[PDB]
Amino acid sequence: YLGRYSLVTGKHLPEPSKSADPKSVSAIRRPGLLDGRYCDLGMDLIIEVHIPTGGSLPFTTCLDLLRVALPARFAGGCLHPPSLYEEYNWCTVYQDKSTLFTVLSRLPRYGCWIYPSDADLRSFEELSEALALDRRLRPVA
RNA sequence: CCAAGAAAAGGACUGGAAGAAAUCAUCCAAGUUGGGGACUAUUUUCUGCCGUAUAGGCAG
DNA sequence: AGCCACATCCCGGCACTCGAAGTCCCCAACTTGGATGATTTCTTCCAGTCCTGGTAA
DNA sequence: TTACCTCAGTGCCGGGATGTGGCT
């Protein structure tokens, strides 16, 4: 789900990790420069979790472990939880489709859900026509 | 276990000078707001003595 | 046909009403005629510097 | 070291009881 999307201009400067000469030189050079594109995100995820064992562990302990397991890296950038001074339960679990869907219907109108497409495209010209006709269609990797 | 893993763009700076928006002008004519009506009830405030006294002070 | 488990079912029981005036009805809402001319819209000079290749002679 | 190369209602609540359906 996409709530915020901001494009950032410019490009990163590399660390001076390369000596100017291998020996008898006290000068440091810059490896080289690349031209990329970066952005800041705000997003929610809904993961379908399954436990093979007949007896499950729906406990506070597991909610702590779900907070610990969360990676710090995402899409090459840095991932953070919501700020501490305004913290609420950002890591809830549902075992009912009716309760979960009801809560999701309340999301702000200016955000986007991203769904899989049906169309089969074999060229950029076919993509050009599909994009001219729809307004909801986007190419992705 | 993410076109994966690591990363300091920094240092300095004078926009200035000068100016005439002006002349003219007719909003008018007519007009029916009207007819009817309960603030008191299950109220609480009585009965006396002193004092010239509808003044002022008192017991029950 | 006889025996046992599990469904509900109806009477006795229990708890609530709850303070505490009323505030006007109905029908109509304007026609006509015109919106100005003549003139002009700036000129001088300037527009940084340095670092951040791979490959083979 | 260097050179190269791009656009009168109602709502729970207890408790004993009436009655029933399946197995032997």
SS3 letters for A66-84?
Answer: HHHCCCCEECCEECCCCCH
Task: Report the alpha-carbon distance of residue A67 to residue A136 in Å, rounded.
Answer: 34
Distance in angstroms, CA of A122 to C1' of B21? Answer: 70
> What whole-number distance in Å separates Cα of residue A118 and Cα of residue A130?
11
- Cα–Cα distance measured from residue A78 to residue A64, given in angstroms and rounded to the nearest whole number: 21
For the CA atoms of A11, A17, A21, A22, the dihedral, rounded to the nearest 10 degrees, stands at -150
State the structure-solving technique: cryo-EM
List residues with CB under 7 Å of strand B: A 12-15, 17, 31, 71, 73-76
Q: Name the CA radius of gyration of chain A, rounded.
A: 23
CA–CA gap between residue A108 and residue A128 (Å, rounded) = 31
A68 φ/ψ angles, rounded to the nearest 5 degrees: -70, -45
Per-residue flag: A33 CB under 7 A of strand C: yes
Q: Quick one: which H or E segment has residue A28?
A: strand A28-29
Please tell me what resolution, in angstroms, this structure has: 3.5
Interatomic CA–C1' length for residue A42 and nucleotide C16, angstroms? 54
Q: Residue A34 — φ and ψ, nearest 5°?
A: -120, 160
Give the total residue count for chain A.
141
